[PDB]
Amino acid sequence: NLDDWQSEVEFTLPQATMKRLIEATQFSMAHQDVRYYLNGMLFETEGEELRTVATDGHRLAVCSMPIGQSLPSHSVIVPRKGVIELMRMLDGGDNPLRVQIGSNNIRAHVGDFIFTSKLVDGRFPDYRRVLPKNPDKHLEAGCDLLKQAFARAAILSNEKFRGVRLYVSENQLKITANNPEQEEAEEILDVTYSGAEMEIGFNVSYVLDVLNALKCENVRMMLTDSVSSVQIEDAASQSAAYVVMPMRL
Amino acid sequence: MIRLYPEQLRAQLNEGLRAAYLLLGNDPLLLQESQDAVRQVAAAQGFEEHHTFSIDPNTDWNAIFSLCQAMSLFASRQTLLLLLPENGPNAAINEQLLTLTGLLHDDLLLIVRGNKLSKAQENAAWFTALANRSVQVTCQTPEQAQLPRWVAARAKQLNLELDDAANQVLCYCYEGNLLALAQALERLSLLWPDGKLTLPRVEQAVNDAAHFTPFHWVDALLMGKSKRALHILQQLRLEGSEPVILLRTLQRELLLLVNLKRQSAHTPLRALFDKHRVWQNRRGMMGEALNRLSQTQLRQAVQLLTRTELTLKQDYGQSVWAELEGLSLLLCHKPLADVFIDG
Amino acid sequence: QLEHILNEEHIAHEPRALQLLARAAEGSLRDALSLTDQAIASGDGQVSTQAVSAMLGTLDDDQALSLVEAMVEANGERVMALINEAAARGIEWEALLVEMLGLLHRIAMVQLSPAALGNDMAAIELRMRELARTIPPTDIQLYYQTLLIGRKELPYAPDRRMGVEMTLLRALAFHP
Amino acid sequence: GPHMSYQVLARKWRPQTFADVVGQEHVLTALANGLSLGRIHHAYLFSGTRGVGKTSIARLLAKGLNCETGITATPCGVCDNCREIEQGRFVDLIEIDAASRTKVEDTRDLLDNVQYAPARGRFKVYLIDEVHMLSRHSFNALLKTLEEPPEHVKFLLATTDPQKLPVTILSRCLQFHLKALDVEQIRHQLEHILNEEHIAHEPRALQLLARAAEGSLRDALSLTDQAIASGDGQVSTQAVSAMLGTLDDDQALSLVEAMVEANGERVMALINEAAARGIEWEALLVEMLGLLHRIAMVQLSPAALGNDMAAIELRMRELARTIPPTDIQLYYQTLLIGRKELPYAPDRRMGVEMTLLRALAFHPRMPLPE
Amino acid sequence: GPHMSYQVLARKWRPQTFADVVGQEHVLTALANGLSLGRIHHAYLFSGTRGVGKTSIARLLAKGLNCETGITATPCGVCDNCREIEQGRFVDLIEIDAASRTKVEDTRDLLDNVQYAPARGRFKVYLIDEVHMLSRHSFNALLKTLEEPPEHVKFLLATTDPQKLPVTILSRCLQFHLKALDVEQIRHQLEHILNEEHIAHEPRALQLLARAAEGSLRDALSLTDQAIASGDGQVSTQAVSAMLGTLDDDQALSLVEAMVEANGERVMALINEAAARGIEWEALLVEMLGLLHRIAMVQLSPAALGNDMAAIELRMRELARTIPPTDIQLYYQTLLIGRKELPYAPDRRMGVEMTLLRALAFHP
Amino acid sequence: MRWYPWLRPDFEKLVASYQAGRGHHALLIQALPGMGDDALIYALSRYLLCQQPQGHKSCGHCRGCQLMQAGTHPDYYTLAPEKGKNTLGVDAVREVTEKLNEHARLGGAKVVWVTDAALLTDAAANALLKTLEEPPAETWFFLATREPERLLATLRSRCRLHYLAPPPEQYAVTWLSREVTMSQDALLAALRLSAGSPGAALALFQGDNWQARETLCQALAYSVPSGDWYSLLAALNHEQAPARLHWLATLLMDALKRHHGAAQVTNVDVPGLVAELANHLSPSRLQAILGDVCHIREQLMSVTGINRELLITDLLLRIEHYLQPGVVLPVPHL
DNA sequence: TTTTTTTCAGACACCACTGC
RNA sequence: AGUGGUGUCUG
Numbered sequence A: 001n002l003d004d005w006q007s008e009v010e011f012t013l014p015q016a017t018m019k020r021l022i023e024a025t026q027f028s029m030a031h032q033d034v035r036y037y038l039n040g041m042l043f044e045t046e047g048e049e050l051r052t053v054a055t056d057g058h059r060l061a062v063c064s065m066p067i068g069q070s071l072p073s074h075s076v077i078v079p080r081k082g083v084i085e086l087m088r089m090l091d092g093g094d095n096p097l098r099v100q101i102g103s104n105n106i107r108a109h110v111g112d113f114i115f116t117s118k119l120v121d122g123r124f125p126d127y128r129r130v131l132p133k134n135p136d137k138h139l140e141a142g143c144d145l146l147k148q149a150f151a152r153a154a155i156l157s158n159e160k161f162r163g164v165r166l167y168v169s170e171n172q173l174k175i176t177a178n179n180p181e182q183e184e185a186e187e188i189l190d191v192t193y194s195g196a197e198m199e200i201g202f203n204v205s206y207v208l209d210v211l212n213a214l215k216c217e218n219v220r221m222m223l224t225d226s227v228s229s230v231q232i233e234d235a236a237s238q239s240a241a242y243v244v245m246p247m248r249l
Numbered sequence B: 001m002i003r004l005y006p007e008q009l010r011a012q013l014n015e016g017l018r019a020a021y022l023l024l025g026n027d028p029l030l031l032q033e034s035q036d037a038v039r040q041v042a043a044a045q046g047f048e049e050h051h052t053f054s055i056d057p058n059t060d061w062n063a064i065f066s067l068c069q070a071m072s073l074f075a076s077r078q079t080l081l082l083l084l085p086e087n088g089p090n091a092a093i094n095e096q097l098l099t100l101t102g103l104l105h106d107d108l109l110l111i112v113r114g115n116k117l118s119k120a121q122e123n124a125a126w127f128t129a130l131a132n133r134s135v136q137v138t139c140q141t142p143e144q145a146q147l148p149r150w151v152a153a154r155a156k157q158l159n160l161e162l163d164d165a166a167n168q169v170l171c172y173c174y175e176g177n178l179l180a181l182a183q184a185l186e187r188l189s190l191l192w193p194d195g196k197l198t199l200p201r202v203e204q205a206v207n208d209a210a211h212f213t214p215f216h217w218v219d220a221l222l223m224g225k226s227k228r229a230l231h232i233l234q235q236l237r238l239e240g241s242e243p244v245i246l247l248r249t250l251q252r253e254l255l256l257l258v259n260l261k262r263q264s265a266h267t268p269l270r271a272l273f274d275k276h277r278v279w280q281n282r283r284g285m286m287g288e289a290l291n292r293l294s295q296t297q298l299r300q301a302v303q304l305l306t307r308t309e310l311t312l313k314q315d316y317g318q319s320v321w322a323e324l325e326g327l328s329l330l331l332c333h334k335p336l337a338d339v340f341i342d343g
Numbered sequence C: 001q002l003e004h005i006l007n008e009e010h011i012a013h014e015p016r017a018l019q020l021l022a023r024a025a026e027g028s029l030r031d032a033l034s035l036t037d038q039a040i041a042s043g044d045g046q047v048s049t050q051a052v053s054a055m056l057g058t059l060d061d062d063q064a065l066s067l068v069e070a071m072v073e074a075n076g077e078r079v080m081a082l083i084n085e086a087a088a089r090g091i092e093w094e095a096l097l098v099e100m101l102g103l104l105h106r107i108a109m110v111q112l113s114p115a116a117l118g119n120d121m122a123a124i125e126l127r128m129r130e131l132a133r134t135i136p137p138t139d140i141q142l143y144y145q146t147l148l149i150g151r152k153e154l155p156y157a158p159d160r161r162m163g164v165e166m167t168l169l170r171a172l173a174f175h176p
Numbered sequence D: 001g002p003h004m005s006y007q008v009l010a011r012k013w014r015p016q017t018f019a020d021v022v023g024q025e026h027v028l029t030a031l032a033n034g035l036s037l038g039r040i041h042h043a044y045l046f047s048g049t050r051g052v053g054k055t056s057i058a059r060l061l062a063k064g065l066n067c068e069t070g071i072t073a074t075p076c077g078v079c080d081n082c083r084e085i086e087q088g089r090f091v092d093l094i095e096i097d098a099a100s101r102t103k104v105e106d107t108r109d110l111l112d113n114v115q116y117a118p119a120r121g122r123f124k125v126y127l128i129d130e131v132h133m134l135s136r137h138s139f140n141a142l143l144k145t146l147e148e149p150p151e152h153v154k155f156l157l158a159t160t161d162p163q164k165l166p167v168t169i170l171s172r173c174l175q176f177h178l179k180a181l182d183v184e185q186i187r188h189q190l191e192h193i194l195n196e197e198h199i200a201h202e203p204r205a206l207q208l209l210a211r212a213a214e215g216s217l218r219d220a221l222s223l224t225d226q227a228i229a230s231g232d233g234q235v236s237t238q239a240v241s242a243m244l245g246t247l248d249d250d251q252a253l254s255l256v257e258a259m260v261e262a263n264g265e266r267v268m269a270l271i272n273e274a275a276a277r278g279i280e281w282e283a284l285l286v287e288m289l290g291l292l293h294r295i296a297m298v299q300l301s302p303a304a305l306g307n308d309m310a311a312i313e314l315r316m317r318e319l320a321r322t323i324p325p326t327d328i329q330l331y332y333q334t335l336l337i338g339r340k341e342l343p344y345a346p347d348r349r350m351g352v353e354m355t356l357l358r359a360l361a362f363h364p365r366m367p368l369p370e
Numbered sequence E: 001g002p003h004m005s006y007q008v009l010a011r012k013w014r015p016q017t018f019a020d021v022v023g024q025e026h027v028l029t030a031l032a033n034g035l036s037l038g039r040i041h042h043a044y045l046f047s048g049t050r051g052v053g054k055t056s057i058a059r060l061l062a063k064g065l066n067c068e069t070g071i072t073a074t075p076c077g078v079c080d081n082c083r084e085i086e087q088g089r090f091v092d093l094i095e096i097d098a099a100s101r102t103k104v105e106d107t108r109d110l111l112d113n114v115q116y117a118p119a120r121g122r123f124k125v126y127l128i129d130e131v132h133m134l135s136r137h138s139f140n141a142l143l144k145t146l147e148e149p150p151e152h153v154k155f156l157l158a159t160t161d162p163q164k165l166p167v168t169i170l171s172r173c174l175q176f177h178l179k180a181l182d183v184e185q186i187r188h189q190l191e192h193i194l195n196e197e198h199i200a201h202e203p204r205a206l207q208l209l210a211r212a213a214e215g216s217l218r219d220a221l222s223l224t225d226q227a228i229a230s231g232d233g234q235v236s237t238q239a240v241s242a243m244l245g246t247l248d249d250d251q252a253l254s255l256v257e258a259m260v261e262a263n264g265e266r267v268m269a270l271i272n273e274a275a276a277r278g279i280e281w282e283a284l285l286v287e288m289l290g291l292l293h294r295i296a297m298v299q300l301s302p303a304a305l306g307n308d309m310a311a312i313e314l315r316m317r318e319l320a321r322t323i324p325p326t327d328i329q330l331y332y333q334t335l336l337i338g339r340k341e342l343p344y345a346p347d348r349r350m351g352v353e354m355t356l357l358r359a360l361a362f363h364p
Numbered sequence F: 001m002r003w004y005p006w007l008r009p010d011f012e013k014l015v016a017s018y019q020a021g022r023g024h025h026a027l028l029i030q031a032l033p034g035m036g037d038d039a040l041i042y043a044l045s046r047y048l049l050c051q052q053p054q055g056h057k058s059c060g061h062c063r064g065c066q067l068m069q070a071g072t073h074p075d076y077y078t079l080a081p082e083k084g085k086n087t088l089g090v091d092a093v094r095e096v097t098e099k100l101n102e103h104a105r106l107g108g109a110k111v112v113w114v115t116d117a118a119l120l121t122d123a124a125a126n127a128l129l130k131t132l133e134e135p136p137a138e139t140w141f142f143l144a145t146r147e148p149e150r151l152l153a154t155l156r157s158r159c160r161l162h163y164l165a166p167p168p169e170q171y172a173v174t175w176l177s178r179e180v181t182m183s184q185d186a187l188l189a190a191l192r193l194s195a196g197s198p199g200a201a202l203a204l205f206q207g208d209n210w211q212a213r214e215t216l217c218q219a220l221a222y223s224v225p226s227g228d229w230y231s232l233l234a235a236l237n238h239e240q241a242p243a244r245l246h247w248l249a250t251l252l253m254d255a256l257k258r259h260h261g262a263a264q265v266t267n268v269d270v271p272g273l274v275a276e277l278a279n280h281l282s283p284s285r286l287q288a289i290l291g292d293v294c295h296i297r298e299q300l301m302s303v304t305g306i307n308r309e310l311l312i313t314d315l316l317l318r319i320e321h322y323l324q325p326g327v328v329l330p331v332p333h334l
Numbered sequence G: 001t002t003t004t005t006t007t008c009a010g011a012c013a014c015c016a017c018t019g020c
Numbered sequence H: 001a002g003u004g005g006u007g008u009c010u011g
Ligand SMILES: Nc1ncnc2c1ncn2[C@@H]1O[C@H](COP(=O)(O)OP(=O)(O)O)[C@@H](O)[C@H]1O
Pocket: D009, D010, D011, D012, D013, D014, D015, D020, D021, D022, D023, D024, D049, D050, D051, D052, D053, D054, D055, D056, D057, D189, D217, D218, D221
């Protein structure tokens, strides 16, 4: 049965750590995308850090957590089904989790049982270039405060493409939504910010999933211009970053 | 059981009601009227509560068993009805029909409605256990040679005066369509309370609804009636019949005709008929056809039939109905041109 | 009914335009009414015979029957005009040949027996009768063979338009 | 050369008024008259071939209905509503890509929101494009709201084949059939566009482009863009002739004559010359076949010849008067059989060569010596 | 050091940049001028026969469009975008196998994502290959987005059968026709490949492969790899002639001569001998067609016989003096119909025999 | 899956190509039915998927080869027509292509084998493109076909084609005599009926179809002198109609050959019947009958769902019509 | 007496039962 | 919403 005698990387990782690691990245995977390398989650190992990267070409999600054990740099793409069922079977955080990744198959020893899956042959893209390289605008807000405003705006949102325009002015944020029925929703929020007036229209479900993934109290958004991406993370850490590339509508 | 036509059903119902009534046949109208009469007679003898069920692989048999065994707070004298599926008493249904045949009682009256049963295939068990004390009612569509007297009887019993011309017009527009034929008589009674129907009266208020099967087309071809066969072909086109079914139905009899005409040089047609196991009513029309411009239409028509078959079975645009018109005209003593035959 | 509707609408109408619209309706009164509103559109509040006829010709798709009528009659200019019409409409050419083939086949079957006309073609009954009664079966045979050969060789042509035009030219040149 | 002028003629030259359309006059006149008299039917269908102004005219009508001024047949440009419609993303002009909303649940969702009043304009103009993609259930669902919709909702349908629609709908909605465009209109449009694009152009180039567009102006605009890309932002006879992969009619007629006048050596010489120019052999056969068909059509009637090939008109007439129709039919059939057998010839060059040799051997008035 | 292993001559030698493309100068110069002048269309349809370059040209266009240098006619390597595009990693190049995603759900959820901004590149290129296999509703779904795509989306269609596309789909694209490669240039590309890969060869095998590739370079590379396997890494004349059925001798002339005289026993005996030789029936028939073609040539204009066959020259000239042109044309047509119907025969030998039976008994 | 001797050299020429890593991924085998293409492809797959191949054969010890022997191997994909259907759908091809995105389960190569490329649907064949073109790493494809020109042009464009030559006639007769013991002319005619493929001739002898061929021969011994070709229907109508139509056409070809005095005919063991065919039937009629028999065989083979009884009945009636004087004969056309 | 149909591929449409 | 089945209609 087990003919994968040699493994590329090995982990003895706490269950809660990988639970957060996947839960902070799962929603950004691609479901049955033509780009077969994007229909999965990239586990990346460098130093003592393990990162999960998931993108569908419209949103990127990267989450990094230390392990303590030094590991060689490695990359692997676990398909949608494998990672979803691994997440499902990942319960009972008391027992540790063993991970054994080879060049062609992945194994996860959870509690007492073993899980096996195959890999996606393709090579995952570099997410460092997707991350904006010159974030000149930085704004901060409250996670729940920002999230509830987005939900209220999303109530009257285009049901097909849930998109809102976010405007940033001095210590002020604006979220405007409209649907084919011209039903307009407008939410204004008090933030701390220093920069220039800028409008950017992006999806609502992606931002709401990003905010739900960051179960924090302070959120920092980094923006460059109206056309490039937005990098959202929490202000209490830098271990999880998200990239929302806007709409041109 | 008592096998009965719809004519005497009333009389039988006046004599008494049996444990189960089986209404079988391919005619919706005859089955419906028989069921209505049975239900009315049952209600006359106290059978007040009714029920309906469609015998289907997804039906809830437990409800049927519960209602047949148990009785109700009111109207204890109860009747039950079941619609048999198109195929009939499926092999997964005969056992549960047997259970019903055990789960019955003198309080309940069972009504069985569906198409004709292939008795050669299905017999005994359920059939004989009902035959103990039941009635079978055969309600099948009268054929063309029998429809005019049926329509005359219906007009007499509905108090209308139909002459031969109106009768044949009604028998023309509505064949296999006895439901719409009865509705046409009812509509004509509504149109004129005089009750006297003439040629123009029926001619105006009638539509060419009809309903034919490929066997009707093949029979019309064998009798060599051009207008009848073309009417049948148009009717199956409008009805949406699959032309390949028509092709196979014509092909069987056409290859039989070819074999008979080839073998008739050494053997009289009677012994050939006996050899191929063909029935007497079929025998008459096939003998009529075999000596009607044969040995040329029997290979030319096979050529045209092969042309239609290949054209139908290669592409997906069909357009074979005109070619079927060509066949309908070739086998009815109306010679065609080699241009359309060969192609 | 169209006459009454237009008279009560105070709409100026010509008697022939109403018959043209009714014939174009195919038996449905709502088709006649929609065509009537459109005919008033093609103009200024008046249903003129010329405007209605031009609109009907613009909407006309009965090209194969007219092509067979003009080709059997040996009317080269009318045949070429009808081919120009079928080209301007963006009508498929193989479909045009198939329609002509079906029409000729039906004409022959009618010539064999009058019962060959079903209720699917009640719009074009009279013309079919006119073509079946007046044209000998030999000419119909020749034209059917010519159009079958032309449709067989249609893919290998400078273009479908020229292939159809040349097939009809051959059929005309037969003059049988 | 120029800046990021990527905006292609296909879209940058989408008509924006009823004065900028290339002559669908049977449609434009009816729309203008109805909009002037106010007989704005609640649903109708532009049906035609590709690229002949169905979608464009539908947008122009939406502009005409929703202009800030009174309902007019000539839409304005300073009006905010027409500006939004032209730029897209208008509140009320709901373009429906019917090939993406074929399902009946999408149609039901559309019909639920019909009764809602228009937001900023005066009509909620539904523009269902490529209607023939709707399923049968979607069509029947549209039936009732197509009979009489709310007073503010207009249906603008557009499709290529109007015969795939159930005929009930063909009763419900008006029908406007947009026919293909003559060569002159296409060439004049190309002239005007290249004048406004500051691109020097030559006459024969535009005539060839308009001939190869096949009656549709979107094909003409894509071909013009391809020709501008083939040259250095310049439209010339050489560039268009190389792009279209055809031959000047003089060479084809010279080869056809060499075939007819039994000048087999001239046939060989012109075959070698066409080999030098690197032109497809099947193209040579198709061009000779087209010229033979044109000669036959001239034999039918003098009016067969179009102005596009006027340069060889005289020779056409001569070759039409010299050759009786039976020989033209024989040549056309021989070349047709040669083209049909060309894929199985050992080489395309020698396939065309043996087709010509067969047309020369079976020559009735001057057969090859036995 | 191959990425994992030698990835076949056809896959390794795709045009990596411009000026590496063999032929196709029409589309190459047109795309170069479009890139340099700013005349960039949103939908390019590269239509042509097999193995003349339609996916490779489209990939080069995608590289040029969103290269880090700019909108460049000649894409570089080294930098990120054109390095990822050739490695099948770049996100903004979405490669669709339209023969597998024929469904309309796939086309619709492809069009769903078109509105989003590109990941890193300027243009979100959609390269749909084998487009003709898309379903009817799929083409009609793509209609309104090929017509008016967003400013950051480019569509690159590639088709072997452009006729099968709806006229509307053809109408919304630049239909770049990829002309087939003639013998000389496909031979030159084979020579350059074999020289750069340090594989010894002979010229005659080169033009044999060039003329047996039917104007397709992918078939030339496939035949070259087959000859490499057969010839132990050497593209030699003998190995190609044994692998690719060729008639070195004059038996194609002998059988034609016996068939001209309507001699039956000799024709059948020579066919049996050829079958014993393991001849290629398609090659025999194409050689017969070419031989009758040259007979007709020397019948029309004397001394048109190629110097190459001077060895047998007189014989064909004798035929040119003897057989009237009509009979030669009839033999050519019969043999060509045999070529067309050779695949659809119970056997290849049986098809050739039927063809020569039809061709043998015209006159007697 | 039996190993035929004539595969032994060709196997080498292929397996050596897969030993240096130089092997074209998509290898298309052109071989007559029974020639042994399936056994060759199977042996190649066993060599390829073994984790520790030895020389040029399957080791017989590793996990890959023992799983292949067990009929279950996740890295071994086969494309065969669904039972009861002579067609390979697009769904199976598409499923295998999607499964090819995942890595190899056992860490080795991925071997996809299409049983017969001629049965592929047009859609199924097209879905196999862009996967034959650029398959993922360590993916080996295989295909088989009776006649490569019948496949899609683009499909065989991206394939290295290996042709399995039928063995020499004397050697094939020797192999058949070693297998089964009958008259030499019987084996010879069986071979040259089967396009020189000993496998098809052997399958013909093992089955009852040779008795049906003899039945057709007897029905022809009655049919030719009396012009009663309709009777042949009883000897023609069967599930194996194409084989009997091929036999009829080959008898007609032998008659035409004897008319021209050909040295060698096909039905070498049936001289009396071919003599009757030659003497009674005019060569023009013989050619027309042969052409129509071949055309009917091709129509019966190609178009699916066709009625064999209608086709054969029309063919026989048309032949009988042709025998009569004053009728024209078919002309082959383009 | 019964006797009645090819096919591969694709697109919808409705209706369980699940699962929140 | 996911999954599975029935059934009908288009080439
Ligand atoms: N009548 C016309 N006048 C001017 N341009 C036209 C016309 N018809 C088509 N075009 C050209 O075609 C392009 C697209 O036309 P479109 O209206 O979308 O055709 P469709 O009816 O097929 O949707 C336009 O941008 C325009 O350049």
